[PDB]
Amino acid sequence: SKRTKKVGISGKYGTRYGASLRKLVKKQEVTQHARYTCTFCGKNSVRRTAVGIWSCKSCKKTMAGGAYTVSTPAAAAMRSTLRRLREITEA
């Protein structure tokens, strides 16, 4: 009762656009429809509305993030480095 061998979510495209393109689109699509835990209220209800907007269904807060993920490794490393630099320099 798996209905698929390896194609997964990107089975709606049938036999078009090529295997490599379907694999590339599937890898990035899978992370866009999932659900993520809210950082403020803690409940597991946060979903994507627009290209860079994610909102929680419980506390109704909305946050601006990446295109297909709440946060980016570059932005996380930049926030962490900026916090470290500020606290060492001014304290």
Partner 1 sequence: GRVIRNQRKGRGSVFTAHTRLRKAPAKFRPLDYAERHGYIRGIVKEIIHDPGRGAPLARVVFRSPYKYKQITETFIANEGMYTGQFIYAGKNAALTVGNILPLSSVPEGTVVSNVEEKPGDRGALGRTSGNYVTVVGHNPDEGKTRIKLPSGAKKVVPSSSRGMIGIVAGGGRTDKPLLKASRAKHKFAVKRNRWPKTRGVAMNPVDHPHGGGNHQHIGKASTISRYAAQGQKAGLIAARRTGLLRGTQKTK
Partner RNA sequence: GUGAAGCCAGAGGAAACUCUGGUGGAGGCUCGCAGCGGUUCUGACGUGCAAAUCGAUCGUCAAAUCUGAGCAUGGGGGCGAA
Partner RNA sequence: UGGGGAAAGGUUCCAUGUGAACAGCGGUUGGACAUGGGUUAGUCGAUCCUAAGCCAUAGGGAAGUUCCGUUUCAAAGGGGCACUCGUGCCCCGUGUGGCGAAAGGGAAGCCGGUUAAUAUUCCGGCACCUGGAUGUGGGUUUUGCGCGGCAACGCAACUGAACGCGGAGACGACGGCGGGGGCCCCGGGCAGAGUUCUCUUUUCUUCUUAACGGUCUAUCACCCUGGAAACAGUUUGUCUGGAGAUAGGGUUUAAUGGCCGGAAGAGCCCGACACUUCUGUCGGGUCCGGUGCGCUCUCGACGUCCCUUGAAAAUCCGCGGGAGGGAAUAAUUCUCACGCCAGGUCGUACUCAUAACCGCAGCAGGUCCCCAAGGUGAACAGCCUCUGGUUGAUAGAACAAUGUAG
Work out whether 56 is an interface residue with Zn ion (CB under 5 A): yes
Compute the Cα dihedral for 22, 28, 29, 31 and give only its sign. positive
CB of 90 to RNA, least distance (A): 30
How remote is the C-alpha of 77 from its chain's centroid?
17
Q: With CB under 7 A, what is the number of residues at the site for RNA? A: 28
Residue from 8, 23, 28, 43 in contact with partner 1 (CB under 8 A): 28
20 is in an annotated binding site: no
Is 54:48 a contact under the CB 8 Å cutoff?
yes
Does the annotation flag 59 for ligand binding? yes
Binding residues: 38, 41, 56, 59
